[PDB]
Amino acid sequence: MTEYKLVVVGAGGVGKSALTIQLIQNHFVDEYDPTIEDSYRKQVVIDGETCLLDILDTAGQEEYMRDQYMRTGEGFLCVFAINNTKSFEDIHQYREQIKRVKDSDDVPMVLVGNKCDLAARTVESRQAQDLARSYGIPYIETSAKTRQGVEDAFYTLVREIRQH
Ligand SMILES: Nc1nc2c(ncn2[C@@H]2O[C@H](COP(=O)(O)OP(=O)(O)NP(=O)(O)O)[C@@H](O)[C@H]2O)c(=O)[nH]1
Ligand SMILES: [Ca+2]
Ligand SMILES: [Ca+2]
Ligand SMILES: [Mg+2]
Ligand SMILES: [Mg+2]
Numbered sequence: 001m002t003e004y005k006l007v008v009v010g011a012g013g014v015g016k017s018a019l020t021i022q023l024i025q026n027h028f029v030d031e032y033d034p035t036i037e038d039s040y041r042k043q044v045v046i047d048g049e050t051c052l053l054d055i056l057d058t059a060g061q062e063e064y065m066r067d068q069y070m071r072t073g074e075g076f077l078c079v080f081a082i083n084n085t086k087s088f089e090d091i092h093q094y095r096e097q098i099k100r101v102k103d104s105d106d107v108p109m110v111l112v113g114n115k116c117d118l119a120a121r122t123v124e125s126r127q128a129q130d131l132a133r134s135y136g137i138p139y140i141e142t143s144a145k146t147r148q149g150v151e152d153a154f155y156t157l158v159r160e161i162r163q164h
Pocket of ligand 2: 027
């Protein structure tokens with residue numbers, strides 16, 4: 001019935017779970033409970049096509065078998081937070097991991113700068129645009145808190161999988 005397997009990766013606390021929960025359940029998770037590995041499914045219409053999204057929400061905390069879960073992914077949301085410079089610097093490492101698990105240099109991906117509602121910005125849009133350009137992928141900013149950009153980020157990833 002047309003299924004897209006999406007995987008959300010990135011450093012601990014950047015908002016991977018909050019983003020996914022906003023997309024699927026339409027509310028903001030205010031508390032921080034570190035994830036091990038969670039799965040969500042939802043039927044949606046994207047550009048006139050009824051499809052099923054299967055979303056894997058992965059651990060960002062080193063302490064919390066991710067590789068095995070990521071293997072099945074068709075597209076990856078690589079998330080950092082715009083007030084967390086280290087999370088941005090670590091994007092390179094997540095992308096390298098994706099390329100290992102997929103054994104390919106051509107994997108559908110979108111770069112996401114989350115927490116754009118916050119004002120303590122240390123990653124400027126232009127820096128992230130440049131990183132995304134070097135990877136040949138789109139950059140999109142989101143806020144799981146306000147819901148701004150959330151649907152756009154996930155639907156953009158579906159549109160990247162369709163170009164593969
Ligand atoms: N202001 C604001 N807070 C956010 C946003 N997204 C997430 N948060 C907050 O940041 C904290 C961590 O969010 P969470 O979604 O659990 O992060 P995670 O990337 O899933 N963490 P982990 O890798 O450990 O599972 C929570 O307190 C959450 O409310 C956002 O867009 N804006
Ligand atoms: Ca809440
Ligand atoms: Ca491999
Ligand atoms: Mg989480
Ligand atoms: Mg600077």
